[PDB]
Amino acid sequence: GFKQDIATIRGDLRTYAQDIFLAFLNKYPDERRYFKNYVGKSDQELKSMAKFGDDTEKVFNLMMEVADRATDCVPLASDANTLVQMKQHSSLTTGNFEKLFVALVEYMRASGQSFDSQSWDRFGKNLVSALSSAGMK
């Protein structure tokens, strides 16, 4: 289930973080606008780019924690808060999160792994709601 998926991702975090985020950026290339130096690079170039490594690990280690601290896929208010008032997220609206979660769930469903894909969809849904209740668009 959801709890195990967190352990699965943590076990191989670097690889899952890069592959999922690459799935995200390839599905929605215009989302690169928030990162900038991402454009003009293939998957392999991004995987070796220092900042992409840093960005993806920071996104996914915290994502796993927000997931882990949640109850029945409902995030803590404090976790929604950090995500909203992060200076790095000043350009974001809830739709950016929705798109990340479309890609992530699509990745899990296509994978040769027993992910609880439906829970990650539900978690994405609840996180958008919590982000909006803390202030997004």
Ligand code: HEM
């Ligand atoms: C729930 C999923 C997400 C989590 C847990 C998360 C968390 C984080 C964390 C921990 C950082 C590092 C902040 C620091 O340097 O201290 C970060 C940076 C950043 N995040 Fe997110 N984030 C998420 C979703 C997103 C999405 C969907 C986008 C846009 C598509 C985004 C855009 C950014 C950007 C642009 C940065 C700054 C990278 C830089 O230094 O240039 N985040 N995020």
